[PDB]
Amino acid sequence: EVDYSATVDQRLPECAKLAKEGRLQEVIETLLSLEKQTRTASDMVSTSRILVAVVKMCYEAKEWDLLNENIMLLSKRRSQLKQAVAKMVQQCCTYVEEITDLPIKLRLIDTLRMVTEGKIYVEIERARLTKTLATIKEQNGDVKEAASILQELQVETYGSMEKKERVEFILEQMRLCLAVKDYIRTQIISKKINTKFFQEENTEKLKLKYYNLMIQLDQHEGSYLSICKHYRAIYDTPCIQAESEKWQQALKSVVLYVILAPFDNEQSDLVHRISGDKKLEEIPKYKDLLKLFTTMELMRWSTLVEDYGMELRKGSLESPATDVFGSTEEGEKRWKDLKNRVVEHNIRIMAKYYTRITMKRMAQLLDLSVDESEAFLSNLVVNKTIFAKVDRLAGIINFQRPKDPNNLLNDWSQKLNSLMSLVNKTTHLIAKEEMIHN
Numbered sequence: 001e002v003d004y005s006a007t008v009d010q011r012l013p014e015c016a017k018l019a020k021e022g023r024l025q026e027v028i029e030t031l032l033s034l035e036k037q038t039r040t041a042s043d044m045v046s047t048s049r050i051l052v053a054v055v056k057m058c059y060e061a062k063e064w065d066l067l068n069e070n071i072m073l074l075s076k077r078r079s080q081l082k083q084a085v086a087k088m089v090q091q092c093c094t095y096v097e098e099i100t101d102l103p104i105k106l107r108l109i110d111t112l113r114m115v116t117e118g119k120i121y122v123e124i125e126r127a128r129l130t131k132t133l134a135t136i137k138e139q140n141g142d143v144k145e146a147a148s149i150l151q152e153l154q155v156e157t158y159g160s161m162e163k164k165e166r167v168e169f170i171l172e173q174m175r176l177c178l179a180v181k182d183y184i185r186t187q188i189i190s191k192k193i194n195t196k197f198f199q200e201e202n203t204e205k206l207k208l209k210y211y212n213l214m215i216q217l218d219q220h221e222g223s224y225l226s227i228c229k230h231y232r233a234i235y236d237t238p239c240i241q242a243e244s245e246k247w248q249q250a251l252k253s254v255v256l257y258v259i260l261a262p263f264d265n266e267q268s269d270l271v272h273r274i275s276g277d278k279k280l281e282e283i284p285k286y287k288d289l290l291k292l293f294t295t296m297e298l299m300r301w302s303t304l305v306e307d308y309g310m311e312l313r314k315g316s317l318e319s320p321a322t323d324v325f326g327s328t329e330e331g332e333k334r335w336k337d338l339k340n341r342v343v344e345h346n347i348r349i350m351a352k353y354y355t356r357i358t359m360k361r362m363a364q365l366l367d368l369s370v371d372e373s374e375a376f377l378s379n380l381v382v383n384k385t386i387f388a389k390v391d392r393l394a395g396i397i398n399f400q401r402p403k404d405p406n407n408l409l410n411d412w413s414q415k416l417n418s419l420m421s422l423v424n425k426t427t428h429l430i431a432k433e434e435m436i437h438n
Helices: 006-019 025-041 043-058 064-076 082-098 102-115 118-140 144-153 163-179 182-192 195-199 206-223 224-235 244-259 264-277 278-282 283-294 302-314 329-353 359-365 370-382 407-436
Strands: 354-357 388-390 395-399
Touching: 006 025, 006 043, 025 064, 043 064, 043 082, 043 224, 064 102, 064 182, 082 102, 082 118, 102 118, 118 144, 118 195, 118 244, 144 163, 163 182, 163 206, 182 206, 195 206, 195 407, 206 224, 224 264, 244 264, 244 278, 244 283, 244 329, 264 283, 278 283, 283 302, 302 329, 329 359, 329 370, 329 395, 354 359, 359 395
Parallel strands: none
Antiparallel strands: 354 395, 388 395
């Protein structure tokens, strides 16, 4: 248009000297007038330099009141250029990091976050200032306010922010939410992260931070199977897989958590996938333990403690123990749940092979008292996990359901079908031997 350019190149150094001499209130009025000519002229580059200029003068002169008043004023000018205000805020948020005085920094943050509110072109900055405001409102304590301040930022909708930086914001929202014990809120924020984003280039640090945070979130609820999947994702990271101490610890928790998970189709399928890995050989104790939950046999809880108790709870210097079964309250609760899994596994085995068993025998085989075994068995019967009818007078547990005449004859029919197929198959096998030996 009527681009000013060198016109501001003549004033700006001259105004720079007068600011140092002490004349600031007069020169800003001069630069406000010069800004008006440029803004009306729609000179993007020149107007940007003036707005960046004036905030520098009020910063170098420590005019905190004037700096905040100017930032509000020059942002509210009629038909202000959006790029020029962006450069002002980008240059002003640099001054935020430099300032160490907390009350002065906070007022500038509040002023800057107010002139950047609801505006797309400065949405990246207001995000970073919101992150900056939260850290100040966290290193000083009052994590509740820091969590609230950061949570309201819908960073997923911010299109200008880079995807890598966008995820970093979400993880901090989760970190503050977990630190404030807001597990309901943390789950909702967790859905904002697409797990496929970690399949890209070097962002593994976010993947470890993300999954370790989900481990903490899912630990409170008790979803052991979900915890195992998160640890399996930590196990698959190239950074963890490239160093022995890291992947060994991750694989230790992968095995130790699928074991704690109650049996189902998903859990059973996971054990086969985990057992298929050849890296369990570097931790032979955990490989054998995972196998013990795979063999279709009774395992004794007393044997487990005497064979795997020290390696799992206390561990060794050569192979350190994970926090699944530590001395903590969480570790003790998980230790009790492991005994349930052993007891549950035994009842599942006792249902496959036994047709009728004695409560006295079941209590002995479960390392439980008769009352505890009956109470434990009564629990599984109620949640339909295992069928069992308990005749308490005779001390008998009956694992066979009543035989429907359909089922009895269907089993008879299925035997005939297999028999006729076998007779068919044998005849074909005979024909081949007639061919070879004739």
